[PDB]
Amino acid sequence: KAPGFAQMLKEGAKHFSGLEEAVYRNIQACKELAQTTRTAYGPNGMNKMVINHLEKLFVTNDAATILRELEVQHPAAKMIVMASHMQEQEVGDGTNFVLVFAGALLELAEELLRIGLSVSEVIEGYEIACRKAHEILPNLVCCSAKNLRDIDEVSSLLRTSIMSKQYGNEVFLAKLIAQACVSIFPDSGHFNVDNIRVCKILGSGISSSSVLHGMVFKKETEGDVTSVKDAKIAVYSCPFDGMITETKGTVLIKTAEELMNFSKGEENLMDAQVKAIADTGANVVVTGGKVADMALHYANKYNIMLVRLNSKWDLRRLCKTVGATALPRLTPPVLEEMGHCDSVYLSEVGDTQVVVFKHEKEDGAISTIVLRGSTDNLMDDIERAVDDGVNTFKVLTRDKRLVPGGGATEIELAKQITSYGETCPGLEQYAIKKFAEAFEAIPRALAENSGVKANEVISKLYAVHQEGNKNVGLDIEAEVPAVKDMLEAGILDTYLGKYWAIKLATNAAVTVLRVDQIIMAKP
Amino acid sequence: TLNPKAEVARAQAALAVNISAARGLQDVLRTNLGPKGTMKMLVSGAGDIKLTKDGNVLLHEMQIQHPTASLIAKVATAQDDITGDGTTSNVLIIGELLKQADLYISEGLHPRIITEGFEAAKEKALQFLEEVKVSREMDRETLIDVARTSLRTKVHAELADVLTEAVVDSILAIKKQDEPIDLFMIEIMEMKHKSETDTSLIRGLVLDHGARHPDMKKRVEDAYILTCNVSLEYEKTEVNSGFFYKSAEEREKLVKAERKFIEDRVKKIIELKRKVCGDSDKGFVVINQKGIDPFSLDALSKEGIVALRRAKRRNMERLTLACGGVALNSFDDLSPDCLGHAGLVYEYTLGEEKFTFIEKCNNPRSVTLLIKGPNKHTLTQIKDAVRDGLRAVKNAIDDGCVVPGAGAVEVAMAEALIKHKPSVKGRAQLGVQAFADALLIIPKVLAQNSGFDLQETLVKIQAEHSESGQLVGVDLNTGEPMVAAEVGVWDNYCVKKQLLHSCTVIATNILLVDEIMRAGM
Amino acid sequence: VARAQAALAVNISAARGLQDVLRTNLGPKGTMKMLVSGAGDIKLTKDGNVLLHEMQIQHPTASLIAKVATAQDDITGDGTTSNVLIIGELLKQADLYISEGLHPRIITEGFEAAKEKALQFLEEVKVSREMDRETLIDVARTSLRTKVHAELADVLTEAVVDSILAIKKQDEPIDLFMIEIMEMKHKSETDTSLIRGLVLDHGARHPDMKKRVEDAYILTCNVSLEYEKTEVNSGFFYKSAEEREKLVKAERKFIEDRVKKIIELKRKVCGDSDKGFVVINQKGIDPFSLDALSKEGIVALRRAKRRNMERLTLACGGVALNSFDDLSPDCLGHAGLVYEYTLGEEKFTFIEKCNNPRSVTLLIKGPNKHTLTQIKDAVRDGLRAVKNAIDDGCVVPGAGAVEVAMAEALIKHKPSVKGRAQLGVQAFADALLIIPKVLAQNSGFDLQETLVKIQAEHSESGQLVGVDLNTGEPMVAAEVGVWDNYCVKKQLLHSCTVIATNILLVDEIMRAGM
Ligand SMILES: Nc1ncnc2c1ncn2[C@@H]1O[C@H](COP(=O)(O)OP(=O)(O)OP(=O)(O)O)[C@@H](O)[C@H]1O
Ligand SMILES: Nc1ncnc2c1ncn2[C@@H]1O[C@H](COP(=O)(O)OP(=O)(O)OP(=O)(O)O)[C@@H](O)[C@H]1O
Ligand SMILES: Nc1ncnc2c1ncn2[C@@H]1O[C@H](COP(=O)(O)OP(=O)(O)OP(=O)(O)O)[C@@H](O)[C@H]1O
C-alpha cells in the first residue's frame, strides 16, 4: 500500500536508502567478522570454544578453524573469507593478517564516508597507498637466511611460526620440524608441503615424540613378515573374510553336516584369494577392513606381509604416494592398480611397532612426524602447527628475504606512508592517511591481547622510530609495557608472506567497497 | 464499478504508479554508470555470488518484485540483441522522461500531447546525429580508445591496459577485406590457479581433454592432423554374428576377435603416419572425439602420435576450420586427402589439469582468448567484460561512423532540441522541452559517480560556446569541461541510434497506459 | 527530532497549500471565498488581504504568508493575492533543483540577480501617458471588475473617477481622508452615485421644517442645548415635586436665552427675503427648541460626529463655536442646496453645491448587509489603484503582459556572479509565468493552449501580448484598455524576492518557550 518501499524493488530484498546507508551495512558485516579474530591474534590471544556440526567439542585458536566452523552467510563478509583462502595459497601465514588489517581498513573507511567523500575516490587512494607499500617493503628487509641446510639455521628461524600456534612448545617443535625439512632441502625446487605427512599416536606428551623417514603408520604388521623389499603393493579396502559373490550365490545350510562343509569352503576360498596375490609377485598387502584369524595363517604360509589400516585418510595417503589404487573387490589379481616402494619393514619407536615405507634407490622426499599426546584435542592443535610450520618454510625455497615482526614492520610502514601522504596534494591524501592508521591496529591487537594499554605501546613505538632505532617490536609481558629489539630476540617473519598479506587485504577493501547493494536473484 | 477477484484503478492515480515505479528503477541503476560507478551483488540463494556492472545482467537474470518494473527489464533483452551496448544508459533516459512529464500532467495536460512531442524531438535529434558522427577510417589507435571506453567500466583500473590489446588484435585478425564479422569465431576459455592479469591470446584452440600416457610428446614442432569420429575402444559386432561361447572364459576370446575389427583400424593410423611424412623431426596428432582404448594408445604413443579423446562438439567444429581436415567417419576410407596440419602442438601443464594448444597457424579462422583468474566471480566478470568489449569494437568496423563519448553528444543534442521551433503542433514543444532535459541526465549522473558537484559540472560544459564545431564532455578526474573527441572517449553510432529509438517507444507505452487491472490475478 | 532538510519540505507544502487555495480568486473570472465568523457573520470577498488577515489558518508556516499581505497594502494597496501565487511557484520550482543536491543559498543568490534585471525591464515597458478622464477609466476597470459580478462594473467607474478628479488640482498630494464613505440600506445596488456635499446621519425632525433650502448661511455650533448643569455657582435642591417644576424652569432658562440669540443673529445678518439658515449643532438639541427655530425658517440638525464637524468647517467655512454668549458673524458659512433625502424608514440631510468643500462623499447603496461591506472594500481598493495612477504617471500593460515579456528577457540573460546562478534566473522565469497559467484555469480554458499562443506572439517591433478572458486568444493590452500600475509591479518583484528568500533560508525548526 501507499507509501511503497523505497528502492526495495527486486524480490523483496532489503535495499537500504541513502539515509539508511546501504554501504555502511557491509562495513558492519566485516566488523563483526574481524572482531572474532582480533582478540585471537598473538601468543597472548584467547582460545575459541569450537562446537562442530558433528557435535564434537574443540578448543583451538587457529584462524582457519574459526572461519570454517562459523558459517558466515553475509556475502559482503565472504569477500575476506575468499581472500583468506587466497592467503592459504602460495604462503601459509597471514590468515589473521587478512582478517585484521582489512577489517581495520573498512572501519577507518567509514570515518571518511561520514565527511562526505565519494566511494570512488577513497578506493583510488587505497590502490595508490598499496603500490607505495610495495616499495618500502624491500627497504624494510633487515637480514636474510644463511641457506646452509643445517638444523641450527632452520630451528632459529622457525620460532616465529611456532609462536601463537602452540605456546610452550617453542623449544620442542622448532627441532622436530627441523629434522624433517632438511631431507628435502638438497632437492632444490622440490620442497613440497604434501611430502611431510603427520601421524598421531596416543601417548604421554610432546617430549616423547620423534621424527622418522618415509611413510609411517601407527598400525603394526598383522603378519609375521618383518622386512621385505617387494615393490608390488596391493591395497584392498575390503575386509578379509568369506567370499560373497557379485552374482546370486545362495548358500543353503540345513543340518550340521552342511555347517562344516561351507565353513571349510570359506577357509578354502580365503586361501585362494591370498594365493591370487602370491602368483603375481606381490608380498605387500594393506587391508582396509578387518582381518580374520584364518587369513593370518595364510599370510605366513606364502610369507606375505599383511598390515591393516582402518582409517580412510591414511589409506588415501598411499594412493598419492606410490600410485596404488584401493580395490573394493576381494583381492583382484591386477597389476596396474599397484604401487612402487623400494623397502617396507617393521620397526619400533617408543615401544610402539610402526611400519616404514621408504625408498633407497630413489632419492626420497617422504617424511613422517610421529606425534604423541594425552588429549586428542590438544594433539590436533599441534598437528595444524606442523602444516603452518612447513608452509612457513615452503615459501623460503624462493628468494630468502626476512622482515622483523611484532609491529616492527608495521609502525615503520605506517611512518613512511604518512610521509608520502603528507606531501601528496589533492583530496587523495585522506585515503593514504587512513591506510597508515589501519597498520596501527595490528600492534594494537597485539598489545590489547597481552593485557597492556594499546596507546602506551604505540607512543613507545613511535618514539623509537622517530629517532631511527629500527626493528623495535612489542615485548611480550603483561607487567612490563616496554619494548625490545627484534633482531636480538629472534623474531623474523617472511617478506613474501607480508607481501601477499597487504595485497590481498587491500583488494578485500576494494571488492567490498565497490558493492553497495545486495540483490537476491532467482535462476 | 469493480468486480471481486480483481483490482482496478479507475482514477488518474494509475498513471502515478507506473511513473513512480520507473523512478524507483532509475535510482537503482544510476549508481553503476561509467568507470566511477559502483557494483551490484548477485545472490543466487544457494551461495553463488557474482559482481557485474552490465545492465543486461542487472535486469534479465536479476529478478524483479514490482510488476511495472518487469517491463523495463524486458527492454534490456531487446537492447542486447541489436547493439549489445547501452542498457544502463537506456533506463536512465526513461527514468527522467516520465519524471519530467509528471510536472505537466499535474497541470492538466493529456499524455497524448506529451508523447507527440517525443516523436517530434526524436527526428530532430536523429537529424542532428548525422553531423556529430565522424566517418574517419579505423586503425590501431582509434580501436584502442574505443576499447578503452567500454572495458574501463568493468575493470577496477588495474586490468585496463592488458585487456585492451587482447580485444583489438583478436578482432583485427578475424576481419579483413570487408567480410562480415562473426562473434562466434572467438572461443572464450577460462583457467584457474593464476592471477587475473595473466589473460593472454591463443592463436589456435584450447582443448579440455588431453592425452594420458607417459610416453607422449610434451611439445611437437610440426604434426599432421587427422579428424576422426569413430570410437577405437571395444565395440559391438559389424557382421551378422552374435555372442557364442562355451563358458565365461570363452567370452574374453571373442572380445579379442571383436577387437580385430577395431585394432585393424589402429594399424592404419600408423600406416598413414610412416608413409606420409614419417621421417625425422616430424609428428602426428589424432583429434578423434570418441574414446580410444589404452591398449591402442600404447602403440600410437611409441610412434610419436599424440592421440586425443573425449572432446566437445563445439571444439570439433573449430578443429576442422583450424587445420582443414575433413572429419573421418569410416576408417575403411582412410586417405591422406583429409589430413590437416598445424604449428606448435604442445601441452602446457597447470596446477590441476593439462590443456593442449594448436597455435602458430597460417590462417586457422579461429582465435581463442584465454582468460585466467583466481576466483569464480572474477572469472565471470572478465568474461562479461570481454563480450561487452568485443561488441563495441565490432560496431566500429561495420559502422565506420563513431560519436564522441563522455556525454558530448547528449549535451550538443540538448542545445539543438531547445533551439527548435514547433513544427507539428502548438503544444508539442512541451514534449520537446521534456525530451531536451531527458538527455541531460547522462552528464548529470556522471558527476555524482565521480564525486563532483552535479550543477558545477553541467553549467561548465554548457557554457562552452564558439563559432566552430565543438563537442565537450565531462571529466571524471578534474571536473572541468573536457573535449571527449581529443582525449579518446568514443562511442558507436549504433548505440546512440538505438538509444533515441528505444527510449521514445517504451516511455510512450508507459505514458499511454490508463488503467491497471488484474486479468485472473 | 528530524535534524535534516525536512524543515524545508514542510514549509514548501504550506506554500503549495496556500497557492492551491488562493488561485481560484484571481481576476474577474475567478470564484469567491466565504468568511464565517462562527456566530453567523457571512462575508464574500476576492481581496487577498482580507483573505489572509481576517482569515485564520492552522498551519504556522502559512501564518507567515498572512503577515506578508498585511505589509503589501500599506505601501501600494493592490496585488496581495498575486503576491502569494508567485511565491508559491517560486518555492515549488526551487524544489526541482534542491533535491538534485543544490544548496538553497545558491538559488537565493540567483533570485537577487533576476530581481535587478526584471526591475530594469520595468522601466522600458512603462507608458508615461498624460492622466486624463479616459485613461483612468481603464485603470479603474482592471481593479473594480474583480470585486463585482459584472452588473455594477459600468456604474462604479464614473463614481470613483470623478471623485478623485475633483480633488486633483494645483499639484496637491492626494489625501484619502478627504473622501467620506457612507452606507445606506433600502435601495438597490446600482443606485450608487457621487455626492458633492456631505451626508449627515440625523436630520431635522419637525413638521414645520423646509424640505429644501436653495441658499443658506450655516452657523457652526457645538453647544449642548439639552438639560445641562449650572454654569453659575448654584446647586440642585428641591423639597417636593412642585419644587422640581420651579427648578426645571430656572435651569432651562440658561438654554432658551441662547436659542433666541440665534434668531437675533439671523435677523441682523441677512434677515430679508431670499435667504436661509441651517444649524449644524453636533450635540443634542431640546425638542422644545426645535419649535422655536422652525417657525422662522431655521432647519436645525443634531447628533453629529466629530469627524463630520471638521468636514463641515471646510464645506461652509464657519469657525467651531463653543459658547453662544459671544455669537459673531465670522462663524457663519455658506452652502447651496440643503434638502432632505427620504428613505423608506429614515431621512438624511444633503448639503451639496458648496463653495469650496475640498471633500467628496461617496454614496454607496445596497439591499443586504454583506453587500454593503463588499462594495466598501471594493471602493477602497479601486480608489487606491487610481491614486497609484495619478501620483505615478507611468503605467504598465495588464492581462499578464509584463510577466510574459519578463520571461523572455530573463531567458536571454547570463549571470555575472557565478555559473551556478543560472538556475536562479531559470526558476524565476518559470515562476513568473504562473499568472498567465492561473488566468486560463479561472476563465475555463486550457492551461497549455493559451500559454503557447501568448509566447509564440513575437514581432520586430514594440508589441505586448496578454491573455483573453473571453476567447483565450492573444490580446494586446493597449488595444482593449487593460492597464496596471507601475508602482504595484515594482513592489511585486521586490516583495517576492524577500519572502521567497526567508522560506529558502531556514533549515531547522524548534519549539520555543517564550
Ligand atoms: N612472540 C612474538 N613476538 C613478536 N611478534 C609476534 C609474536 N607472536 C606473534 N607475533 C606477530 O604476530 C604476527 C603473526 O602472528 P600469528 O603467529 O598469530 O599469525 P599466524 O597465527 O601464524 O597466522 P595463521 O593463522 O595463518 O597461522 C606477526 O606479525 C608477528 O610479528
Ligand atoms: N573514459 C570515460 N570518461 C568519461 N565518460 C565515459 C568514459 N567512458 C564512458 N563514459 C560514459 O559512460 C557512459 C556508459 O557508461 P557505462 O559503460 O557504465 O554503461 P554501459 O555499460 O555502456 O551501458 P550498458 O550496460 O547498457 O552496456 C557512456 O554514455 C559514456 O558517455
Ligand atoms: N479584464 C482583464 N483581462 C485579463 N486580465 C486582467 C483583467 N483585469 C485584470 N487582469 C489581471 O489580473 C491581475 C490582478 O488580479 P486580481 O485583481 O484578481 O488580484 P488583485 O486584487 O490585484 O490582488 P491584490 O488584492 O493582492 O492586489 C492583474 O495583474 C491584471 O493583469
State how far the Cα of B66 lies from the Cα of B44, in Å rounded to an integer.
19
- According to CATH, the superfamily of the domain at A214-364 is GroEL (3.50.7.10)
- The sign one gets for the Cα dihedral C254, C257, C263, C264 is negative
Contact indicator for C312, C220 with CB cutoff of 8 Å: yes
- Ligand 2, atom nearest to B34 Cα: 18
Nearest residue to C375 (alpha-carbon basis) of C139, C194, C53, C156: C156
d(CA C483, CA C485): 7
Sequence length of chain C is 514
Mutation target vs C (from B441, B459, B464; most C CBs, 10 A cutoff): B459
Classified as helix, coil or strand, B233 is coil
Distance CA B466, CA B496 (A): 24
C478: enclosing H helix or E strand: helix C477-480
Measure Cα distances from B345 to B201, B266, B296, C59, C199 in Å: 16, 22, 21, 86, 124
In a domain, B2, yes or no: no
In b/e form, how buried is each residue of C377-413, taking b as 16+ CB within 10 angstroms?
A: bbbbbbbbbbbbbbebeebbbbbbbbbbbbbebbeeb
**Residue C56 carries which side chain, given as an amino acid letter?**
Q
Q: Are residues C204 and C351 in the same domain?
A: yes
- Tell me the residue type at C301: L
In the annotation, is B380 catalytic? no
Same-domain pairing of C46 and C18 = yes
CB contact at 8 A, B438 and B428 = no
CATH of the domain at B499: 1.10.560.10
State the Cα–Cα distance between residues C172 and C168, nearest whole angstrom: 7
Q: What is the separation of C-alpha B479 from the centre of its chain, rounded to a whole number of angstroms?
A: 32
Residue type, B39: M
Task: Quote the strand ranges of A206-342, DSSP E.
Answer: 210-213, 215-217, 227-228, 233-236, 284-287, 305-308
Domain co-membership, C208 together with C352: yes
The burial of A62, by beta-carbon neighbours within 10 Å (0-12 exposed, 13-18 middle, 19 or more buried), is given as buried
Residue B326 and residue B335 in contact, taking contact as beta carbons nearer than 8 Å: no
Q: Are B107 and B516 in contact (CB under 8 A)?
A: no
| CB contacts < 8 A (B, C) | 42
Q: Looking at the complex, does the CB of residue B27 fall below 8 Å from at least one CB of chain A?
A: yes
In the structure grid, which three cell numbers stand for residue A324, read together? 596404488
Domain that holds residue B95: 8-136+401-517
Residue B504 — left, alpha, or beta (φ > 0 → left; ψ -120 to 50 → alpha)?
alpha
Same domain as B60, residue B113: yes
| Residue A312 burial (CB count, 10 A) | 11
SS3 call for C364: strand
B106 touches chain C (CB under 8 A): no
- Distances in Å between the Cα of C108 and the Cα atoms of B444, C71, C421, C427 are 22, 22, 9, 11
Q: Cβ distance C45 to C115 under 8 Å?
A: no
Cis peptide before B404 (omega within 30 of 0): no
CB-CB neighbours of A327 under 10 Å: 17
Alpha carbon of C406: minimum distance to chain B alpha carbons (Å)? 19
Q: Which ligand is nearest to the CA of A162?
A: 1
Which chain C residues are Cβ-neighbours of B460 within 8 angstroms? 419
Do B249 and B359 lie in one domain? The reply is: yes
Contact C449 B426 (CB under 8 A): yes
Q: Which residue of the set B68, B87, B380, B457 is catalytic?
A: B87
A57-60 vs A48-51, strand pairing mode: antiparallel
Query: At A238, which amino acid appears?
Result: C
CA distance linking residue A344 with residue A282, whole number of Å: 12
The answer to whether residues B232 and B331 touch, using CB atoms and an 8 Å cutoff, is no
Question: Which H or E element spans position A113?
Answer: helix A95-113
Query: What are the φ/ψ torsions at residue A208 (nearest 5 degrees)?
Result: -90, 5
Which of B364, B392, B427 is the endpoint of a domain? Answer: B364
Cβ neighbours of C101 in B, within 8 Å: 448, 453-455
- The answer for residues whose C-beta is within 8 angstroms of residue C120's C-beta and 6 or more apart is none
For residue C315, which of C335, C286, C291 has the smallest C-alpha distance? C335
CA B429 to chain CA mean position, Å: 39
Residue A230: is it exposed, middle or buried by C-beta count within 10 angstroms (0-12/13-18/19+)?
Answer: middle
Which letter, b or e, does each residue of C7-18 get, where b requires 16 or more Cβ atoms within 10 Å of its Cβ? ebeebbbbbeeb
In the numeric block, which cell numbers belong to residue A167?
A: 605456546
Q: Shortest CA distance to A179 belongs to which of A145, A210, A218?
A: A210
- Report the distance separating Cα B117 and Cα B123, nearest Å: 10
Query: What number of other Cβ atoms are within 10 A of residue A266's Cβ?
Result: 17
H or E stretch covering A517: strand A515-520
Number of C-beta neighbours around residue B27 at 10 A: 16
| Residue to probe by mutation, ligand 3, list C22, C51, C74, C78, most atoms within 8 Å of CB | C78
Question: What nine digits make up the cell of B141?
Answer: 589507435
Reduce the DSSP state of residue A414 to 3 states and report it.
helix
Q: Which three cell numbers stand for residue C65?
A: 504568508
Same domain, C154 and C212: no
At A61, the amino acid letter reads N
User: Does residue A249 come out as left (phi exceeding 0), alpha (psi in the -120 to 50 range) or beta?
Assistant: left
All 3 cell numbers of residue C172? 496637491
Q: A260 with A268: CB under 8 angstroms? A: no
B87 is catalytic: yes
Helix ranges, B224-312 (H):
251-258, 260-275, 294-302
The Cα–Cα gap between C399 and C471 comes to 13
Q: What is d(CA C144, CA C157) in angstroms, rounded to the nearest whole number?
A: 8
* A373 neighbors A205 (Cβ within 8 angstroms): yes
Is the domain of B459 the same as that of B504?
A: yes
Q: Under the phi-then-psi rule, with left for phi > 0, alpha for psi from -120 to 50, and beta for the rest, what region is A454?
A: alpha
CA B277 remoteness from chain centre: 42
Q: By what technique were these coordinates determined?
A: cryo-EM
Query: Got the DSSP string for C98-137?
Result: HTTT--HHHHHHHHHHHHHHHHHHHHHH-B-----HHHHH
Among A71, A522, A10, which residue's Cα sits nearest to residue B45? A522
As a whole number of angstroms, the distance between CA A117 and CA A433 comes to: 14
Helix (H) / strand (E) element for A151: namely helix A151-157
DSSP percent split of chain A into helix, strand, coil, nearest 5: 45, 15, 40
Instruction: Give the ranges where B303-440 is alpha helix by DSSP (H).
Output: 313-322, 376-398, 408-418, 429-438
In Å, what is the CA distance from B277 to each residue of A31, B285, B321?
A: 68, 12, 22
CA–centroid distance for A230 within its chain: 35
Tell me the three cell numbers of residue A333: 589379481
Q: What is the CATH number of the domain that holds C190?
A: 3.30.260.10
Yes or no, beta carbons of B63 and A10 under 8 Å apart: yes
Residues whose CB falls within 8 Å of the CB of residue B329, separated by 6 or more in sequence, listed in order: B228, B229, B230
DSSP state of B156: -
For residue A245, which amino acid is it?
A: T
Alpha-carbon distance of A305 to A346, in angstroms, equals 10
Closest CA to B295 of B328, B262, B268: B262
- The angle that helices A454-466 and A441-448 make with each other, rounded to 10 degrees, is 130
The answer to whether C426 touches C407, Cβ cutoff 8 Å, is no
Strands A215-217 and B367-372: unpaired
Q: Does B423 lie at the interface with C, CB-CB under 8 angstroms?
A: no
Cell 557474482 belongs to residue: B50
Domain with CATH 1.10.560.10 in chain A: 23-144+401-520
Residues C322 and A333: their CA atoms lie apart, in Å, by 154
Q: Who contacts B118 (Cβ-Cβ below 8 Å, separation ≥6)?
A: B97, B431, B434, B435, B504, B507, B508
Segments of A53-138 assigned E as strands: 57-60
How buried is residue C215: exposed, middle or buried, by Cβ count under 10 Å (0-12/13-18/19+)? middle
∠ CA C149-C155-C161, nearest 5°, is: 115
Q: From CA B256, how far away is CA C116, in angstroms rounded?
A: 108
Half-sphere exposure of C7 (CA within 13 A, CB side): 15
Q: Which residues contact A462 (CB under 8 A, 6 or more apart)?
A: A411, A415
Q: What proportions of chain C, in percent to the nearest 5, are helix, strand and coil?
A: 45, 10, 40
| Rounded-to-integer distance, Cα A346 and Cα A357, Å | 9
CATH superfamily of A145-213+365-400: TCP-1-like chaperonin intermediate domain (3.30.260.10)
Catalytic residue among C45, C61, C76, C81: C81
SS (H, E, C) A418-483: HHHHHHCCCCCHHHHHHHHHCCCHHHHHHHHCCCCCHHHHHHHHHHHHHCCCCCEEECCCCCCCCE
In sequence order, the β-bridge partners of residue C217 are C277
Q: Out of C73, C138, C286, C381, which one is annotated catalytic? A: C381
Assign residue C360 a region: left if phi > 0, alpha if psi is -120 to 50, beta otherwise?
Answer: beta
User: Rounded to the nearest 10 degrees, how much is the dihedral formed by the CA atoms of B7, B9, B13, B19?
Assistant: 60
Do both B238 and B335 map to the same domain?
yes
Contacts of B450 in chain A (CB under 8 A): 118, 120
Report CA Rg, chain A.
Answer: 29
Q: In 3-state terms, chain B is what percent helix, strand and coil (to 5)?
A: 45, 10, 40
CA distance B158 to B443: 25
Give the other-Cβ count within 10 Å of B380's Cβ: 19
Using left for φ > 0, alpha for ψ between -120 and 50, and beta otherwise, residue C186 falls in left
d(CA A283, CA A286): 10
Q: How far is CA A503 from CA A485, B448, C349, in A?
A: 27, 29, 107
Q: Tell me whether residue C47 is exposed, middle or buried, using C-beta atoms within 10 angstroms of its C-beta: 0 to 12, 13 to 18, 19 or more.
A: buried
Among chain B residues, CA nearest to A78:
B49
Same domain membership, residue C346 and residue C221: yes
Query: Which of ligand 1's atoms lies nearest the C-alpha of A161?
Result: 22
Distance CA B294, CA C299 (A): 148
Single-letter residue type at B187:
E
Amino acid letter for position B176:
K
Q: Is C80 annotated in the active site? A: yes
Within 10 Å of residue B510's Cβ, how many Cβ atoms? 21
Could you tell me the three cell numbers for C29?
473570472
Measuring CA to CA, which residue among A374, A359, A366, A289 is closest to residue A329?
A289
| Cα dihedral C328→C331→C336→C338 (10° resolution) | -90
Residue B113 touches partner C, C-beta closer than 8 Å:
yes
Mutate: best of A5, A7, A10, partner B, most B CBs <10 A: A10
CA–CA min distance C446, chain B (Å): 8
Nearest residue, CB atoms, B107 vs list C106, C448, C453 = C448
Residue A358 falls in which region: left (phi positive, over 0), alpha (psi -120 to 50) or beta:
beta
- End-to-end CA distance of chain A: give it in Å, rounded: 28
CB A393 within 8 A of CB A91: no
Q: How far apart are CA B18 and CA B515, in angstroms?
A: 10
Backbone angles phi, psi at B409, to 5 degrees: -75, -45
Contacts of B309-312 with C-beta under 8 Å, sequence gap 24+, read B309/B209, B310/B209, B311/B207, B311/B208, B311/B209, B311/B287, B312/B208
Subunits in contact with chain A (3 or more CB pairs closer than 8 Å): B
My answer on whether B191 and B240 are in the same domain is no
* CATH code 3.30.260.10 region(s) in chain A: 145-213+365-400
Q: What is the largest CA-CA distance in chain B?
A: 102
Size of interface A-B (CB pairs under 8 A): 93
Crossing angle for the helix pair A495-514 and A22-38, nearest 10 degrees? 150
Q: Which residues pair with B452 in a beta bridge?
A: none
Question: Which residues fall within 8 angstroms of residue C233, CB to CB, at 6 or more apart?
Answer: none
**Residue B1 located in a structural domain:** no
Which amino acid is it at A390? Answer: V
Running DSSP on this structure, what letter comes out for residue C203?
-
Marked catalytic residue, from B68, B88, B356, B368: B88
Amino acid (1-letter code) at residue B408: A
DSSP, res C321: P
Check: CB of residue C17 under 8 Å from CB of residue C62.
yes
Question: Quick one: B382 and B435 in the same domain?
Answer: no
Same domain, yes or no: C252 and C317: yes
- What is the CA angle A122-A128-A131, rounded to 5? 145
Round to whole Å and give the CA distance between B268 and B286. Answer: 12
Phi, psi of A433 (to 5 degrees): -70, -30
Contacts of B448 in chain C (CB under 8 A): 101
Q: What is d(CA A186, CA A150) in angstroms, rounded to the nearest whole number?
A: 11
The three cell numbers of residue C397 are 500593460
Residue B508, CB-side half-sphere exposure with 13 Å CA sphere: 16
Domain count, chain C: 3
B102 vs C contacts (CB less than 8 Å): none
Radius of gyration of chain C (CA): 30
Residue nearest to atom 4 of ligand 3 (CA): C399
DSSP letter, residue C187: S
Expressed in Å, this structure's resolution amounts to 4.2
CATH 2.30.40.10 assigned to domain A23-144+401-520? The reply is no
What DSSP designation does C392 have? S
d(CA B201, CA B29): 33
Grid coordinates given for C240: 417636593
Q: How far is the CA of B150 from the centre of ligand 2 (A)?
A: 7
Q: Decide: B175 and B273 in contact? Cβ < 8 Å.
A: no
Amino acid at position C211, single letter: K
How many residues comprise chain A?
523
Cα A157 to middle of ligand 1, angstroms: 13
Distance, in Å, from the CA atom of A116 to the CA atom of A106, rounded to the nearest integer, reads 16
Taking the alpha carbons at both ends of chain B, their separation in whole angstroms is: 18
